[PDB]
Amino acid sequence: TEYILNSTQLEEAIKSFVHDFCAEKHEIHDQPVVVEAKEHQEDKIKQIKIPEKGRPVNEVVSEMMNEVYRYRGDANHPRFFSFVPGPASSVSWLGDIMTSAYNIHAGGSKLAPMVNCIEQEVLKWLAKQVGFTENPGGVFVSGGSMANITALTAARDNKLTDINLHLGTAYISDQTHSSVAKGLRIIGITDSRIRRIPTNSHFQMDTTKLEEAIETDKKSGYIPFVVIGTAGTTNTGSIDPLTEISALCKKHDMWFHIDGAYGASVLLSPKYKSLLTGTGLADSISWDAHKWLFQTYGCAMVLVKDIRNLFHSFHVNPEYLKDLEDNVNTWDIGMELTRPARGLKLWLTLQVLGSDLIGSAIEHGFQLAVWAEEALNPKKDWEIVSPAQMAMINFRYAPKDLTKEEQDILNEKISHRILESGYAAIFTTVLNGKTVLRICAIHPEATQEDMQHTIDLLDQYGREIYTEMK
Amino acid sequence: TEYILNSTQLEEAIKSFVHDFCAEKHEIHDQPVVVEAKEHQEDKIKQIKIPEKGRPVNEVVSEMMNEVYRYRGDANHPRFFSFVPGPASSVSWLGDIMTSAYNIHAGGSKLAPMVNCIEQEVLKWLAKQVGFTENPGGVFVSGGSMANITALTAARDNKLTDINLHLGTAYISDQTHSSVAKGLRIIGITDSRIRRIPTNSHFQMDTTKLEEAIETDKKSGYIPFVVIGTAGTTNTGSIDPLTEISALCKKHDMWFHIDGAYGASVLLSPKYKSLLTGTGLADSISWDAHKWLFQTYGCAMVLVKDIRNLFHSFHVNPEYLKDLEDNVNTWDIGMELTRPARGLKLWLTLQVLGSDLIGSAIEHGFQLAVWAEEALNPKKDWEIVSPAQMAMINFRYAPKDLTKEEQDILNEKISHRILESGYAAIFTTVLNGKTVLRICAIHPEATQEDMQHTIDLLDQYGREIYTEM
Ligand SMILES: Cc1ncc(COP(=O)(O)O)c(/C=C/C(=O)Cc2c[nH]c3ccccc23)c1O
Ligand SMILES: Cc1ncc(COP(=O)(O)O)c(/C=C/C(=O)Cc2c[nH]c3ccccc23)c1O
Ligand SMILES: N[C@](CF)(Cc1c[nH]c2ccccc12)C(=O)O
Ligand SMILES: N[C@](CF)(Cc1c[nH]c2ccccc12)C(=O)O
């Protein structure tokens, strides 16, 4: 049809975009991190509607570039310091283009033997970094949330049966990411059987309060089956006592899952790999590549010490898929059946950049946060709530002649101010009952001035609003 | 840097691939559907290792094209007739390139308000086609398996509580896809509380046996909470009695989920949309775009009649994300938090191609299977186990002077023979206790000859192996 793009029309539409984008992204350090959409932009989109007849390709492409993609909080920006930024390598993008082109049906071996071989090679390599030396296994999932649900399902099916599984209790901390408890609820573990253990001043799980909670539930008649330790808390980037938790798990016959969606990448850092000592003691661990392995959304991994545990929870044997089966299929490792070759783009990056460069790029993240801390220390009335920890730091502006409520409002306005300035992206979070500014800097192309000028800009906004409030 | 690509190296590396691929895929109709890898290919890959130092980009690129991507069972091929093929539009590929470029964090509105607005517009439109007219809602998930688990999770939380949910029973058919029961087990529903209802000769769920199972479980003290009807069975492409199932669900206060991962796309076909009458009666429905909406893996949708049910099961309010919030975030309707704008590539395809063309391309799928059946009718000893149904058909070559075991082995060798010929991809399945050849043709650029020549080739292989025995 006159609407279908021919091989020449397609190739030109693609090159047109690839060219225009590379030029635009080349100037990223001099672009506002946040580009606000106007008040009537939502109605502009709602009027386009779904057409019965086709439209000129280059007309639709430009429409998306100008009316959709433009208005965003670019987490690819070197001065995006909020949540967990996505400083994806350009090589990862290349991987997506190649993977999406062939559109090979991954999550199955016979139909793509070398595609599966590539993924397993990376998974074996990652498993080596974790400390799994016997018979590991894994699957490239979409997110760490899916990584957690996958791992926890294997944990549930390993420690519980079809008759007593409603007596299972899980154990987390008050700093554990929300997706863990959300995943537990999905797999049938109600909130009434999820224990939230308090953390110390370093935001690490209190293993003493953990054990007595385990002891209480066991005495009560529950069956404690899993403890979720976190290596790189979302808030402060803290690391739970991995060794201490492992000791308790072996004692009480429980599954040890390490939620390392963020911090697991530190295992590739020669300098800081020691920080994650004891990960090999875990039975399963999550690890997001679109985080600190510089991949595009979404490419996350789940790794188990014993692959048999993943096979037990997710294997199927229908009449179909009989000619597609020793050599495990990814669909038998759960929990999806049709999958794109997510891990291939990670392979491409590892080959083009190398493990050394990626390790150092991660170490740069640590340095960026330390630079932020060094710039805050000398400034008056600036308080460090959590020190520079794993490329992560929390702080607030707190003049003493203000009440706590006012201090919260103050730091909120400071975040608001620097956001509209367009120089950096910094949002607020809550820590120890106080509204706090948070910085997570992991972009390899971010410099000392970037961190220094940001704090300098924040300090200016701070003392400015402080006077305005009086 | 030395291993870091600059804007000129990047743009050149991409265009080089885009150029070489388009040329190669332009000649796809004259390429073997399956390209087998040699015995030494696995060790060749294992020897590459993970390097500490970087490598030249185009050297790595060419290595993957020649040693990885090449050896595959191309489901993009117009003569890939196995399972559920993936005849993805080139526009969809373009969508992935744009989406992956900006790398915008979707699954959240405040950080990408117009990206989310686009997805909701597509979801609302799809909801209109399904029959949800009140206050629908949905999410672009990775797969239809994730579509089912998302929907079934909402069903569980809607009909059960934290105190009685271990008494819940679910009901499927013997033709229901494996991912449904697999999803049920994941959300805590054990096999001992999953009922598999027999199907008729048309592979449709026996609603009479369905009700008697519900009555039995309810009388025993169980709590029947969901029935999963399928619109487009994976095997034969049959459609469960949606109306009959809905009546029972309303009668027994149960959640009605329609698994339309494949067949839901038929709603876009003016000719065949009537086949899916009653989809609006469901409480939830799955729908995969990387199947019959011609998208790349992976782009699937889950739609619920009442969006409040999705919010109840997946909403979270942690300390962080407080500056990110009514206007629901996609993470509040589960079950993932970080997401790529999966739905954007579906938007691009709908705008560039239009809903009319896509509807016709689906109708072409119906025609391809009919052409396959028409070519089989005159051929001797060729048996139709399931007629051409929704671009899907099951058949076997069965000479009468053969045993039941021999007939199975025969059709297996026939599949094996045509696979290695490279002309087409056809695998076997089991149906009514018989090994059967299956064809699913949904590629818009597949012709009458393709189906005719394929059947002609199968008959040849059939009459040759029959002679060997
Ligand atoms: C009703 C029905 N429901 C759910 C699913 C699962 O969806 P995902 O596969 O998206 O999770 C299906 C899927 C059926 C298939 O079979 C798809 C398929 C295409 N190429 C393959 C290659 C190998 C195995 C399976 C496939 C299906 O047919
Ligand atoms: C330990 C830990 N475990 C799991 C996750 C799961 O995240 P995904 O499910 O998204 O993989 C996380 C992630 C925490 C985040 O912080 C998510 C996030 C990244 N960028 C964002 C932008 C807006 C809102 C949220 C995010 C995490 O920090
Ligand atoms: N690859 C660059 C080119 F500068 C920078 C970059 C983003 N993530 C990275 C991770 C490691 C090394 C470099 C990077 C890009 O912006 O695409
Ligand atoms: N778009 C074509 C053109 F050649 C064919 C195609 C694949 N899925 C489709 C869905 C609708 C219309 C055409 C197609 C391609 O090969 O990419």
Curated annotation (Swiss-Prot), chain B:
One of its GO terms (molecular function) is L-tryptophan decarboxylase activity. GO terms for cellular component: cytoplasm. Its main location: cytoplasm. It is found in: Cytoplasm. InterPro entries: Aromatic_deC (IPR010977), PyrdxlP-dep_de-COase (IPR002129), PyrdxlP-dep_Trfase (IPR015424), PyrdxlP-dep_Trfase_major (IPR015421), PyrdxlP-dep_Trfase_small (IPR015422), Pyridoxal-P_BS (IPR021115). Homodimer. Belongs to the group II decarboxylase family. Catalyzes the decarboxylation of tryptophan to tryptamine. Tryptamine is a neurotransmitter that induces the release of serotonin, which is suggested to modulate gastrointestinal motility. Therefore, the tryptophan decarboxylase from the gut bacteria Ruminococcus gnavus (strain ATCC 29149 / VPI C7-9) may influence host brain and behavior. Has weak activity with tyrosine and phenylalanine. This is Tryptophan decarboxylase. It comes from Mediterraneibacter gnavus (strain ATCC 29149 / DSM 114966 / JCM 6515 / VPI C7-9) (Ruminococcus gnavus).
